[PDB]
Amino acid sequence: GGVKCFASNNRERKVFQFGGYVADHMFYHHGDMSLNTSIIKAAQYYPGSSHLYPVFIGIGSFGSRHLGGKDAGSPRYISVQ
Amino acid sequence: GGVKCFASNNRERKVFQFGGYVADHMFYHHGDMSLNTSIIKAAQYYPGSSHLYPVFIGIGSFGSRHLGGKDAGSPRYISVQLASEFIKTMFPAEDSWLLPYVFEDGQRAEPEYYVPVLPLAIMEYGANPSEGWKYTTWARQLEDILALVRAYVDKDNPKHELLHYAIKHKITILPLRPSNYNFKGHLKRFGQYYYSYGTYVISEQRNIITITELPLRVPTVAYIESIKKSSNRMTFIEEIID
Amino acid sequence: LMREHAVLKLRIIMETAIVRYINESAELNLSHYEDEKEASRILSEHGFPPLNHTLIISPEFASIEELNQKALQGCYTYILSLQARELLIAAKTRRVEKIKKMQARLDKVEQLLQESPFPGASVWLEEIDAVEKAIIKGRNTQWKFH
Amino acid sequence: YSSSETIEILVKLKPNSLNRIVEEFKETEEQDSIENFLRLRNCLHSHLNFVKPKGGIIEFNTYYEILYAWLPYRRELYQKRLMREHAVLKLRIIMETAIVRYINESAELNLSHYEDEKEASRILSEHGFPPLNHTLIISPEFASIEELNQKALQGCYTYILSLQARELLIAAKTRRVEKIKKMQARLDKVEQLLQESPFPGASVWLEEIDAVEKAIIKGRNTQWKFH
Amino acid sequence: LIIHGFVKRLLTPLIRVYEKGKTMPVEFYYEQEFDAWAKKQTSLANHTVKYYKGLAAHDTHEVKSMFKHFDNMVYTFTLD
DNA sequence: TATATATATATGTGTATATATACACACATACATATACA
DNA sequence: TATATGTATGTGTGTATATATACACATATATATATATA
């Protein structure tokens, strides 16, 4: 859904707007909170993060080493492209 | 955003997915919980709801009279759909090209206002606070409004020039009553205001009063818990069953 | 109604060049020319009007001043971007009857711009009737529109 | 006192207490007494339990097994993309080297004289124009190669009938002839790539290794911002 | 304490606009200021307008350039 | 110093519940504070 | 000893502002708890 969403121009969106897109067009049949948590953690980049080569560039505050990435912003605030 | 979203086919969406759409394309700059609550209460339709002519068709659990519409589902459960022919007739598409728009950040988002075919600001309900002022309306009859606009527009109506004189000199001719649709009590005009009355039914053979109607926009469980806090009234009743 | 009147006149002007180009392109022989500048020159040397095709066919948010201000100042894209499917006899017939329908509609628009009390007084009665029966049909189906 | 990306913790000891640590926390060969004291090592203990294609668990014993299970899928996917490209290139050469002769013979053919699409398709079937499937040739979305050569020659003359009059000009002829030349040179390159050692498509994959490597290096330098 | 300088505040951007090519953005602090600005333009086809809803939407280079100038952008209230 | 418990933490992808605060005003419930007295 | 009479609380509506919590699943590590030895 992220390859298809940022196809025309790679303008960033909020995490909840991209989550609504990927729950609409990829037929995600679950809740919305865990999808936004996965979109947040699928874009983090710091020393000791899970993903060494993330799919997304994250634009905002996405947490740090010192709390293990558990102190990111709400999806209302931060963005990905 | 609903006219723009459901254009291709009128396929259902969820509440949070449609909310993500209308926050992306209409440049909404606020939180998501309040937008989803606004979509939910814009879709509701029960006896005593705010909207008598809602924009959307709601699909799922959208709450009832009893908890005042505060007993809907979560936005991951319930769905909305565009009430396509009502939106087409009231807000014509070839008129929306000729309206002043609002610009957020450079791009067009939405009009300054819609100009409907009917005066929709006096056709529904509402009760809000704000800064400095208060808002509270009670909806009018549909037939009164139709008679007024057909008296203004149609020249073969025998109340045409009388109504033009009344517009010139700020007097009234044609009545304008409150809306009693989907309401089974009764309305009485005493002095300068209307009152709304609910219906009871009494029987002294069993000491039973049966309430069969509450007044306009009265939730049921709020009424029943309000009648239980007055100990001046609790000294006369024993048991209350819904 | 003013916007509709303007767009109808401009579209009559646009299609009553395309139809005579279909009549005259068999011997105009545009396949012989090198590029589109020579083609635009030889099209302007036979009286075809330069038109702004992307605003005649889709007036989105153009007011009537910028409708009659920048639409006759375009190019020959309306006539050079025709598919070869369009050059058949049935497509000519359909364009002729579509020109007839737009001419009748332009006559109706100028006829109901002048009515009493104000312009567009019967149209708003018709929209009153349509909204009223849609409200009835929505009340009958518990606002589900079955 | 740590920054947002670099650790700097500061302890303070009770006075004359460096000596009493060493008898309490004994130094093995594997870790120091301070690293025993300050919790400063951990074991890298793996559980390589994955899921496989067509579902179900799979469980490996080393990372070499995962690499050796991964390599043949990429091998056969290169072979699939090269064979699909070969079929599409032959079919596109076939398509555009009839557009060229229709542009050359439209004056002798006099398409305006005819009545509708039926008579036009009939008079185009008599002069040696191949019936084609224009949608499958322009956009072969997910069509397998048997689907792509099975419903390609089963169409109509829509490829030739949606030609604009913009492209009946001579610069358009030069453009189409040079792109046909580039497509057949690409077809020769594709059928040469389908033969090489040790398996077909072995140089393209080395090029993509180098491209992924330079993109990873650029991303690591820009703090994964790609400025 | 409002007399004697106890209540203070920062001052952050609300809209930053980034010109293609140049290395300095244009910072607007009120929304109507930006609307009156953006209506004056004739070609906004290559500018990237960024709305910063809360202050946690600010990227790393932006917070570095806002914290190099911290005491430059604190204000103090005086009581009339 | 030993063998032995029983509770306790953290990781990703999932399942569910929530709550203060601002803003206006008609309305409902709680005294309580007197003012004649009694 | 009843009466008013001026006090004080108290939910409630829409559109905003900022947060909180339970559960499943595997496995490696942990810090104190425990016998019985004596």
Among the listed residues A23, D51, D194, A8, the one whose alpha carbon sits nearest the alpha carbon of residue B79: A23
Residues B36 and B49: their CA atoms lie apart, in Å, by 17
Q: How far is the CA of B231 from the C1' of F36 (A)?
A: 30
The residues near D122 (Cβ < 8 Å, ≥ 6 apart) are none
Residues D90 and D148: their CA atoms lie apart, in Å, by 11
Please work out, in degrees rounded to the nearest 5, the angle formed at the alpha carbon of residue D86 by the alpha carbons of D84 and D91: 95
Phi, psi of B89 (to 5 degrees): -80, -40
The residue of chain B with its CA nearest to that of A30 is B76
A30 nearest nucleotide via C1' and CA: F14
Phi, psi of A19 (to 5 degrees): -65, -40
CB neighbourhood size of D49 (10 A): 9
Residue pointed to by tokens 């019936």: D131
> What number of helices (H) and strands (E) belong to chain D?
9, 2
3-state SS, residue A13: strand
Residues A79 and A16: their CA atoms lie apart, in Å, by 9
Written as one letter, the residue type at D152 is A
The DSSP 8-state label assigned to residue D10 in this structure reads -
Written as one letter, the residue type at B149 is V
Chain A residues with CB under 8 Å of a chain D CB are: 45-47, 53-54, 57, 64-66
DSSP B188-226: EEETTEEEEE-B--EETTTTEE---B--TT--HHHHHHH
**D25, D33 in Cβ contact below 8 A?**
yes
Among the listed residues B143, B92, C79, the one whose alpha carbon sits nearest the alpha carbon of residue D168: C79
Closest approach of B86 to chain A, Cα-based (Å)? 26
Residue pointed to by tokens 């093995």: D28
**Are the beta carbons of E54 and A77 separated by less than 8 Å?**
yes
3-state SS, residue B87: helix
**D219, A56 in Cβ contact below 8 A?**
no
CB neighbourhood size of B114 (10 A): 12
End-to-end CA distance of chain B: 42
Output the six-digit token pair for D80: 């699939």
Output the six-digit token pair for D222: 């820009």
Output the six-digit token pair for D17: 């207490």
**B36, B79 in Cβ contact below 8 A?**
no
Which residues 53-72 of chain B have a CB under 7 Å from nucleic chain G? Answer: 68, 70
Q: How far is the CA of B122 from the C1' of F35 (A)?
A: 51
Residues C126 and B89: their CA atoms lie apart, in Å, by 10
3-state SS, residue E18: strand
Among the listed residues E18, D215, D226, the one whose alpha carbon sits nearest the alpha carbon of residue A56: D226
DSSP B37-72: HHHHHHH--STT-S-SS-SEEEES-B--TTTTT--B
If residue B135 lies in a helix (H) or strand (E), which one and from where to where? strand B134-137
3-state SS, residue D48: coil
Chain D residues with CB under 8 Å of a chain A CB are: 2, 4-5, 7, 216, 219, 223-226
**Are the beta carbons of A77 and E57 separated by less than 8 Å?**
yes
The DSSP 8-state label assigned to residue A20 in this structure reads H
Q: Is the CB of B102 under 7 A from strand G?
A: no
Phi, psi of B72 (to 5 degrees): -85, -170
DSSP β-bridge partners for residue D50: D58
Residues E25 and E49: their CA atoms lie apart, in Å, by 10
The residue of chain C with its CA nearest to that of D157 is C85
Please work out, in degrees rounded to the nearest 5, the angle formed at the alpha carbon of residue C142 by the alpha carbons of C139 and C143: 75
A77 nearest nucleotide via C1' and CA: G18
**C60, B97 in Cβ contact below 8 A?**
yes
**C82, C18 in Cβ contact below 8 A?**
yes
If residue E51 lies in a helix (H) or strand (E), which one and from where to where? strand E48-51
Output the six-digit token pair for D91: 């079919």
The DSSP 8-state label assigned to residue D114 in this structure reads S
Best to test chain D binding among A4, A6, A44, A45 (most D CBs inside 10 Å): A45
Which residues 56-75 of chain E have a CB under 7 Å from nucleic chain G? Answer: 56
> What number of helices (H) and strands (E) belong to chain B?
8, 11
Residue pointed to by tokens 């375009």: C74
3-state SS, residue B129: strand
Q: How far is the CA of B63 from the C1' of F25 (A)?
A: 27
**E28, A52 in Cβ contact below 8 A?**
no
**Are the beta carbons of D5 and A64 separated by less than 8 Å?**
yes
Cα D78 to the center of its chain, rounded Å? 9
Beta strands in chain D (DSSP E): 49-51, 57-59
Residue pointed to by tokens 């019967």: C122
Closest approach of B149 to chain C, Cα-based (Å)? 9
Best to test chain A binding among E58, E61, E62, E63 (most A CBs inside 10 Å): E58
**Are the beta carbons of E56 and A59 separated by less than 8 Å?**
no
Residues A10 and A8: their CA atoms lie apart, in Å, by 7
- Protein side of the strand F interface (CB < 7 A): A 30-31, 33-35, 37-38, 41, 50, 68, 70; B 33, 74, 128-134, 226, 229-231
What's the number of CA atoms in the CB half-sphere (13 Å) around residue C59? 24
Output the six-digit token pair for E55: 């202050």
How was this model experimentally determined?
A: cryo-EM
Residues C55 and C65: their CA atoms lie apart, in Å, by 13
DSSP D22-36: HHHS---SSS-HHHH
Phi, psi of E9 (to 5 degrees): -155, 150
**F23 C1': nearest CA residue:** B130
**D216, D208 in Cβ contact below 8 A?**
no
Output the six-digit token pair for B228: 């239980």
**G30 C1': nearest CA residue:** D39
If residue D170 lies in a helix (H) or strand (E), which one and from where to where? helix D170-193
* D31 φψ region: left (φ > 0), alpha (ψ -120 to 50), beta (else): beta
If residue B104 lies in a helix (H) or strand (E), which one and from where to where? strand B101-104
The residues near B45 (Cβ < 8 Å, ≥ 6 apart) are B51, B54, B58, B62, C142, C143
Torsion angle of C-alpha atoms B179, B185, B187, B188, degrees rounded to 10: 180
End-to-end CA distance of chain D: 30
Phi, psi of B103 (to 5 degrees): -105, 125
**Are the beta carbons of B89 and C116 separated by less than 8 Å?**
no
Cis peptide, bond prior to residue D198, ω within 30 of zero: yes
What's the number of CA atoms in the CB half-sphere (13 Å) around residue B222? 11
Chain B residues with CB under 8 Å of a chain E CB are: 29-30, 103, 105-106
Output the six-digit token pair for D35: 């690293």
Radius of gyration of chain B (CA): 22
3-state SS, residue A68: coil
A40 burial level (CB within 10 Å; 0-12, 13-18, 19+): buried
Residues E55 and E11: their CA atoms lie apart, in Å, by 11
Closest approach of A61 to chain D, Cα-based (Å)? 12
**B58, B83 in Cβ contact below 8 A?**
no
The residues near D130 (Cβ < 8 Å, ≥ 6 apart) are D94, D98, D153
Strand F, nucleotides covered by protein (CB < 7 Å) = 10-19, 23-26, 28-30
Q: What is the largest CA-CA distance in chain B?
A: 74
Q: Is the CB of B41 under 7 A from strand G?
A: yes
DSSP chain C: -HHHHHHHHHHHHHHHHHHHHHHHHHHH-GGGSSSHHHHHHHHHTTTPPPB-HHHHS--SS--HHHHHHHSSS-BSHHHHS-BGGGGSHHHHHHHHHHHHHHHHHHHHHHHHSS-SSSSSHHHHHHHHHHHHHHHHHHHHTTTS--
**Are the beta carbons of B16 and A32 separated by less than 8 Å?**
yes
Residues E49 and E65: their CA atoms lie apart, in Å, by 18
Residues B10 and E56: their CA atoms lie apart, in Å, by 37
Best to test chain E binding among A14, A61, A74, A78 (most E CBs inside 10 Å): A61
Strand G, nucleotides covered by protein (CB < 7 Å) = 12-19, 21, 27-31
Cis peptide, bond prior to residue C117, ω within 30 of zero: yes
DSSP D177-204: HHHHHHHHHHHHHHHHHTT-SSSSS-SH
